[PDB]
Write a structure and sequence with these properties.
The protein has a single domain, classed as Cytochrome p450. The protein has 15 helices and 12 strands. It has helices at about 35-45, 65-70, 105-110, 115-135, 145-165, 170-180, 185, 195-220, 230-235, 245-260, 260-275, 280-285, 290-305, 335, 375-390; strands at about 45-50, 55-60, 75, 145, 310-315, 315-320, 320-325, 330, 390-395, 400, 410-415, 415-420. The chain has a 5-stranded mixed β-sheet, with helices on one face. A 3-stranded antiparallel β-sheet has the order 4-12-9. A hairpin with a 2-residue loop joins strand 6 and strand 7 (about 320-325). The longest helix has 27 residues, at about 195-220. The chain is globular and about 65 Å long. It binds protoporphyrin IX containing FE and 12-hydroxydodecanoic acid. Protoporphyrin IX containing FE binds near residues 96 and 306. 12-hydroxydodecanoic acid binds near residues 91 and 370. Keywords: Heme, Iron, Metal-binding, Monooxygenase, Oxidoreductase. It comes from Marinobacter nauticus (strain ATCC 700491 / DSM 11845 / VT8) (Marinobacter aquaeolei). InterPro entries: Cyt_P450, Cyt_P450_B, Cyt_P450_CS, Cyt_P450_sf.
Length: about 425
């Protein structure tokens, strides 16, 4: 697993169509991703790259084509993986995000109760109060890094709540999730030490087993089950014994924590970046706070926290005037589709009252459409409500540092200065 070392990305018009390689995990940081995807959308909407560090792959970059691919599980498989590359040999974990129907459906239906409306309504007060306390704690006298202070802080707490994982150890959930989703061989991310991946897998399984048993014993001793996933699984006849199917046990708990880890964090960081590029939108918001839910959809579209999901063609498929061969990897570039002017007028503008913001494809479409979508939107809505209660302005004071990945579109440093109300 070689490290990816940053080099300057040239202008896309310097290249031949055939040599456009969008697997490069520095395209987002260097701010080249937009022009690169624009050339793909306009000149090669269904595009084969025969030569990449991850092997050959197709890129699908227009909004309508991505819908078709994502919705067509009869034609494209999500197995065995949904990142572009491969996980390191021997620590593939099976997750339903990378499974086809019918097995996908059974696994998803066994956990979906944790984000049912009535269950999210139970989490709401705790989300609000944490959000409030975090924001109350922030300094207003000087800049600070919003990423660890707010985005990661609130996210780590949410992950712990989802499993009733011991609160004081929540950092481990985030760490385990980062290392899994950031493997160099998978996404071109910064994690290239396979030993730490094996260590984490071992520790996770020890820690999740211990928790499962602890929660069984607590329930038997008469603690009321909570709104978490483990309580939910222990309530249903079908999942009461999930610990004895180790692959589904680890897979489902892992998927749930990875699912809302960097996505929600980067949505939280992202809206401040968008507000800084389009500061009028923040005045519009203060004047019409009822826009928050639509703004949340706009933040998610604009940021597009996951750039893609990957599929394999189950058979030959004609698309965009090209022939995708059975067995070929195909990458649905949501980051491109959400900036497709054929769908969205003024795609690169952040417009918090954009009429069709809700139609973004940041959550995908079809049978793998993000199961946590309402939980993400809930958290974002609450963040901005609580921001509006406290702050007349939120200024980004330094160019953000962006994460190295072809999959995560994220921020590691976001220096912010707050100005309180009165
Ligand atoms: C803004 C935040 C988020 C974004 C952008 C996001 C994005 C996605 C995407 C793109 C998919 C796959 C779509 C496809 O293949 O068609 C997905 C699946 C999933 N997400 Fe999220 N997600 C977010 C938040 C969350 C949260 C908070 C959770 C859980 C607590 C979560 C849990 C899941 C799960 C379980 C799946 C698997 C769905 C399936 O395979 O049926 N996500 N998410
Ligand atoms: O080793 C493996 O199988 C795991 C490597 C792939 C990591 C997949 C990350 C899943 C992202 C889920 C985001 C859903 O909101």
């Amino acid at each position: 697993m070689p490290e990816f070392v940053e080099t300057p990305i040239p202008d896309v018009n310097t290249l031949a169509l055939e040599d456009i390689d969008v697997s490069n995990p520095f395209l987002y940081r260097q701010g080249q991703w937009r022009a690169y995807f624009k050339r793909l959308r306009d000149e090669a909407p269904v595009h084969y790259q025969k030569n990449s560090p991850f092997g050959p792959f197709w890129s699908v970059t227009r909004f309508e084509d991505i819908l078709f691919v994502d919705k067509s599980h009869d034609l494209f498989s999500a197995e065995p993986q949904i990142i572009l590359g491969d996980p390191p040999e021997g620590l593939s974990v099976e997750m339903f995000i990378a499974m086809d129907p019918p097995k996908h459906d059974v696994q998803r239906s066994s956990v979906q109760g944790v984000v049912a409306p009535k269950n999210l309504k139970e989490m709401e007060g705790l989300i609000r109060s944490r959000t409030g306390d975090v924001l109350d704690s922030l300094p207003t006298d000087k800049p600070f890094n919003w990423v660890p202070a707010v985005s990661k802080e609130l996210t780590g707490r949410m992950l712990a709540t989802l499993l009733d994982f011991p609160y004081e150890e929540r950092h481990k959930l985030v760490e385990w999730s980062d290392r899994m989703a950031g493997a160099a061989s998978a996404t071109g991310g910064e994690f290239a030490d396979e030993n730490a991946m094996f260590d984490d897998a071992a520790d996770m399984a020890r820690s999740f087993s211990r928790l499962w048993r602890d929660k069984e014993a607590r329930r038997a001793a008469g603690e009321e089950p909570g709104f978490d996933l483990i309580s939910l699984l222990q309530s249903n006849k079908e999942t009461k014994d999930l610990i004895n199917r180790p692959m589904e046990f680890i897979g489902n708990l892992t998927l749930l924590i990875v699912g809302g880890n960097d996505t929600t964090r980067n949505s939280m960081s992202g809206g401040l970046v968008a507000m800084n590029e389009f500061p009028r939108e923040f005045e519009k918001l203060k004047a019409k706070p009822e826009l928050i839910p639509n703004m949340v959809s706009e933040i998610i579209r604009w940021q597009t926290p996951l750039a893609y999901m990957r599929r394999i063609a189950k058979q030959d498929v004609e698309l965009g005037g090209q022939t995708i061969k059975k067995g070929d990897r195909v990458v649905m570039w949501y980051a491109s589709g959400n900036r497709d002017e054929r769908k969205f007028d003024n795609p690169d503008q952040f417009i918090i009252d954009r009429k069709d913001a809700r139609n973004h494809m940041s959550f995908g479409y079809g049978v793998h459409r993000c199961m946590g979508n309402r939980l993400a939107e809930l958290q974002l809505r609450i963040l901005w409500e609580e921001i509006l209660k406290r702050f007349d302005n939120i200024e980004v004071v330094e160019e953000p540092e962006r994460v190295q990945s072809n999959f995560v579109r994220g921020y590691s440093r976001l220096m912010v200065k707050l100005t309180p109300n009165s």
